[PDB]
Design a protein around this ligand. Structure first.
Ligand code: ZN
Ligand code: ZN
Lengths: 766, 770
């Protein structure tokens, strides 16, 4: 027995903390305190969506969402949450779904009260000015014309067509000039009645997440949540027909199960993490090995208080009938396999799934809690969930370029629906297998040869190896897809051992990234050399299907995103290697193992771009790069961006309705920093958009002289506060050290308006 | 629809992360990364306890637990975990339970690998030397004789007597000179078969928690957990038997014991506990106190086998009459039925409140809870099914009274005076319980015209804390203190739901009223403190009297060395002083006005030396307790004291506990008592006398008088660099952080650091020669 008498002084860990409340008005509150965090975020969810709009007002809810950003009893639209977030360099978005609606933002810690002040106000007392309604009728009709051509929007309408239950399921919900009406006065009282009936506190939930303490978060809830007003069932979905949908693009198989909507939905996040696992033995490895398919994602959509659709969305290869039957047969057997997961496997994959979640940004964590997949809990009723789903009614949507039927107006969208030509399911008897025990990491042999290696922040912890091609074009598009296909099994294995391996584009720059312990990078780099040398023909084929899918996906994007895709190639055989962290002996063993990397490793040693599109949509992407390498410039470009961005949006989006995409931002692309302008319009031509951007630049030429030195100091403090702090997670942190060089920049701060005005004109005149 | 094109680049929040693995060898690993934490901790739990010892070797497990801290293949007892935790100033302990055993430590972050090295080595390859066995038989037999006088040990033996199911339940498990026997080489073969059978990786779970990344913790778990043995039993559930009355000195108790399946999710028990211990009006404690049926409760949970547990509700009662016991059971059953009605919002509020108390624990204690106690709550845990499982479970009653009849008998090697349970009838229907649901806004209190003084450190800084403390030790009686607690305890629980804090607690000898929260909250709470504390109804003064007598009886039934620590503040020695630590000038000034109506005169804080204190006990236990106060209050002084204590602490332990078994309690530690800092020595022995123990401490101070000059400058530089890192950090929680600022003065203590040997020994002189 212990020989101690008095306990040693003890200091608590200071971890994440949660708390739940119900205000006296009926608002539910969920606070999450994350000490030390950079960002704070908030989200209000309302229990009403599209399905709750009156049958006579299609898209009423969509319109209400737009209009809440158009001014409230204590804030005009500019001083409201939209304009305040933009000045602040925050994030902000909202979503109207079938049965629920949500509004949410992300800012720095301190200005949280001001943000909730405005979120609370727009939710409680929107102006709903007839004049604003008139404007947003046009904005939605534009979004409606654009949505008539969107693959996902039409896929989701098609999926709902596979089920029945109630009228709203198959209604039009986007809205349109036709549907909103000529009587702007009767539209505005429909809005007021919807808002008055559903935007009550007993019908809302507020999530709060920031570095603030639970006590500070409670007070903000009481203060801003207390100022919301105080004061009906859908039947469940029944399975109908399978279908085929004809759409341009890579073919899909979407298996859609109709499920009850349970309170405990974290199991679905663990299911997602297993479904998306690339490891050998899993579902994706099997589909690729047989060239049945290449990717999957999970859709979950609540359709009512006790009714939901869960959709497994496969990108497939041939789109043939026997392909679909093999895929569905594989999914049902894999779901069976998941019954055998041991407690340790459920915990391992469950907490793997939750750390994918904790790595999202606050805004996106709150989104997932409110409308997406919650965090996993280790004592859910896993096998009871599994048995619910495998028995749930399920229908199949094949999406194909040629599919049959003729186009038809369904839910206000053009849907070409034809019968599903299915083959018989053939039992999948081959066993699936999943990670369980992690063995000791092999110790690779070192080559005698040796390649050059940059080593930064030596002998610091959490080492990261970054391998990148010399330039844009030193690695081809088809080679990347070959890299990703071959390393995908192995990166999955490394993720269980807590290593990271990825091959991804980061701001136009292909990076191979390797991180973990010292053993992990050594073993992993060895695995990379072998996986990429003798490439079996499955993986060449898969790489060719992935590239085809990537091309088809691009041709079917909206033009402004397609123009952004085209920016890297408009701005422009050896690789470079940089190790960030780790000791000297790590640097040297990696030096040897890099010699067996299949590509030679060498040691590391633009005028404005205008892109346009014409036709059914008009788009302008203007990139004004900074020619210099100076610290004072790259600082000024960021201060300029921050001052320009809210002005650009307010002038061209809210005042004049130039189009649905309106954005001026700082952007880095293939190591070139510069200012980005983006516009896409249904009416104005690309050249008309370039004219209005030039007009905005001329405006800024004379307006920034007059910026209150109050506004400038607050802007240069705010951006030095965002920027001096390197990232937490070491992959983002390793790029910021090796590539972006955030450190050297807040160095040149602050500066005078004379120096800023100087950098302005150097940037936007020839 | 959104008008953006490119995503704004964002940084993740750097929160807590968790991961689980299984090594090739079968070890389960559960990691928790706590970025920025000061401490790291590790626990290994082994699926074997006392019930698993062979019937022929009473106490084999207890001995194995003692003998694993006596050296292993790569580490002596001094270089091993015990001595190494002592050096680095960390925490260490172990527990053998009915069917499970755990070893765990807590240290600073960086040296975690060193501790895993030692922990791994002692779990895998203990020496188990005969000379140390025979030596440890003595320590345990002394622990046996002491435990035959422990109230809780005997209570836990009586509870098992109310159940049946398998032989080990009622066996003797402490061990004794008698039970261990004279054939020491046969004892050593028994240990080693026990170890070699149960101490293998497939039977072990490793918990690690620190500021390290998940990838680092994973690497450490591989390195040290992979060096554990490889290569790969049930007990039947428990039947209810008899109720009992157990006769023991001390405040009467009632213990209601439910026999349960041992399920895999037990976090619902932590929510039940948060509800059980809630002082709010409408709940269970408030009802017992309003009727003077009893004054406290706690929850016990004991795994007994793979699908058998005992859950025990342990009430400190008032009178202990048959009628009182039946009122308390009637209330508990009604209350458990009340918890059925909790809404999902109430389940989420109390479950997360519960987890917040879990997260206030130190790393070491979180790991203990996970492995052996109440895990964290999960918000979708079939609450009503587990409540329905509990309300349908067989249950038995143990009244514990100072005189209960029957006559002593030897049961589980313990003296137990079991009597029949005198049982009244339940009260057929009884009043409804109610629980917090909605939080209304907080009342704004009105100011008085008067005004009081109030310092104000760290102005206009967030998370303010109001500390009211009496002027000295005799400014508030141990009677009024118990009356303050009884009047605020209701009001403190309600502020806890709104996330403020209100406490009247003794902090290192200093009574302290603490209030923390928003500015609105402190004002409201301070106003409530005044109203609740002005006029106390006889109910509240009775409650205080019951609580005072309970404190007295607990004290005079504790182990001697603990009773002497309780006397140290008295042996060292009516207005109040007001401090605010954070907040506006307007907070300070309105607080200033609201303090005028504090029923005790507040004054401004004013601005001597104490000889050493020797406390002693003689009788069946012999205990000595010496506090050598530092008599100045210079910085270099209050630093040197902390260096010495760090240097002394393992030396005191290695010589007196290990090298000479001088007793089962042995400790040298810096200590701080009613504002006096100093060095504290504590010893308790079943053979040496208090004056003989004083002699070894006298002797020990001379060894360091000479030996201290000869300390490797690297060990001193190292000792001051670990001291300085830990000390310069101010606490996370704002209350501790408030005390450290406004009382302890932690910042100043390290201003003087480092120090050279000449004034370290200069300070050692003043402390002990005078
Ligand atoms: Zn012991
Ligand atoms: Zn829209």
């Amino acid at each position: 027995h212990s020989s101690g008498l008095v306990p040693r002084g003890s200091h608590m860990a200071s971890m994440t903390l949660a708390a739940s409340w119900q205000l006296d008005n009926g608002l539910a509150v969920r606070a999450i305190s994350t000490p030390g965090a950079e960002a704070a975020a908030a989200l209000v969810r309302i229990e009403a969506g599209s399905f709750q709009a009156p049958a006579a007002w299609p898209g009423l809810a969509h319109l209400l969402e737009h209009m809440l950003f158009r001014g409230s009893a204590n804030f005009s639209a500019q001083d409201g949450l939209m304009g305040w977030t933009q000045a602040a360099g925050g994030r902000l978005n909202a979503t109207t779904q079938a049965t629920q609606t949500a509004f949410f933002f992300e800012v720095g810690a301190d200005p949280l009260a001001e943000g909730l002040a405005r979120l609370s106000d727009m939710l409680a007392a929107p102006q709903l000015a007839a004049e604003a309604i008139a404007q947003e009728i046009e904005v939605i009709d534009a979004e409606y014309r654009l949505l008539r051509a969107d693959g996902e929007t039409r896929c989701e309408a098609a999926q709902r067509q596979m089920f029945s239950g109630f009228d709203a399921l198959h209604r039009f919900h986007i809205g349109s000039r036709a549907a909103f009406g000529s009587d702007i006065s009767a539209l505005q009282q429909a809005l007021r009645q919807f808002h008055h009936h559903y935007y009550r506190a007993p019908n809302m939930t507020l999530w709060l997440q920031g570095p603030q303490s639970l006590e500070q978060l409670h007070a903000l809830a009481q203060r801003y949540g207390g100022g919301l007003p105080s004061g009906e069932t859908l039947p469940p979905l029944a399975a109908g027909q399978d279908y085929t949908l004809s759409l341009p693009g890579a073919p899909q198989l979407r298996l859609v199960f109709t499920l009850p909507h349970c309170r405990s939905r974290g199991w679905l996040r663990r299911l997602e993490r297993l479904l998306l696992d690339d490891a050998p033995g899993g579902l994706l490895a099997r589909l690729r090995a047989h060239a049945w398919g290449d990717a999957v994602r999970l859709g979950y959509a609540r359709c009512g208080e006790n009714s939901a659709l869960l959709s497994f969305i496969f990108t497939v290869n041939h789109g043939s009938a026997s392909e679909a039957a093999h895929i569905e047969s594989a999914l049902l057997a894999w779901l069976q396999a998941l019954n055998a997961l041991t407690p340790g496997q459920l915990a391992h994959f469950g907490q793997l799934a939750n750390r994918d979640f904790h790595r999202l940004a606050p805004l996106d964590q709150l989104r997932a809690r409110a409308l997406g997949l919650p965090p996993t809990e280790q004592h859910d009723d896993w096998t009871r969930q599994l048995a619910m789903l495998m028995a749930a009614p399920r229908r199949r949507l094949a999406v194909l370029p040629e599919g049959g039927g003729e186009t038809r107006e369904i839910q206000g969208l053009p849907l070409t629906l034809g019968p599903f030509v299915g083959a018989a399911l053939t039992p999948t008897v081959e066993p699936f297998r999943f990670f369980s025990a992690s063995a000791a990491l092999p110790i690779p042999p070192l080559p005698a040869g040796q390649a050059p290696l940059r080593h930064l922040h030596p002998d610091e912890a959490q080492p990261v190896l970054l391998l990148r091609p010399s330039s844009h074009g030193a690695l081809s598009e088809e080679q990347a897809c070959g890299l990703q296909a071959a390393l995908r099994p192995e990166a999955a294995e490394l993720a269980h051992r807590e290593g990271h391996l990825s091959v991804e584009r980061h701001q136009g720059v292909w990076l191979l990234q390797l991180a973990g312990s010292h053993g992990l990078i050594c073993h992993g780099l060895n695995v990379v050399n072998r996986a990429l040398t003798a490439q079996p023909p499955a993986i060449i084929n898969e790489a060719a299907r992935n590239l085809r899918h990537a091309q088809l996906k691009q041709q079917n994007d909206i033009a402004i995103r397609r123009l952004l895709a085209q920016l890297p190639a408009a701005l422009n055989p050896y690789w470079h290697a940089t190790l960030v962290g780790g000791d000297g002996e790590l640097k040297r063993r990696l030096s040897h193992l890099l010699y067996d990397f299949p590509y030679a490793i060498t040691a590391e040693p633009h005028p404005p771009v205008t892109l346009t599109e014409s036709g059914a949509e008009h788009a302008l992407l203007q990139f004004y790069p900074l020619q210099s390498d100076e610290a004072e410039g790259r600082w000024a470009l960021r201060v300029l961006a921050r001052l320009y961005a809210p002005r650009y949006f307010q002038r061209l989006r809210v005042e004049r309705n130039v189009g649905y995409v309106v954005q001026c931002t700082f952007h880095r692309c293939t190591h070139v920093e510069g200012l980005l302008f983006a516009l896409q319009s249904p009416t104005f031509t690309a050249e008309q958009l370039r004219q209005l951007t030039d007009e905005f630049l001329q405006q800024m030429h004379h307006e920034l002289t007059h910026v209150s030195v109050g506004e400038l100091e607050q802007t240069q403090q705010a951006l030095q506060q965002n920027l001096q702090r390197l990232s937490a997670e070491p992959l983002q942190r390793a790029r910021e050290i090796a590539l972006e060089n955030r450190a050297t920049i807040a160095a040149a701060a602050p500066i005078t308006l004379t120096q800023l005005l100087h950098w302005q004109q150097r940037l936007f005149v020839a």
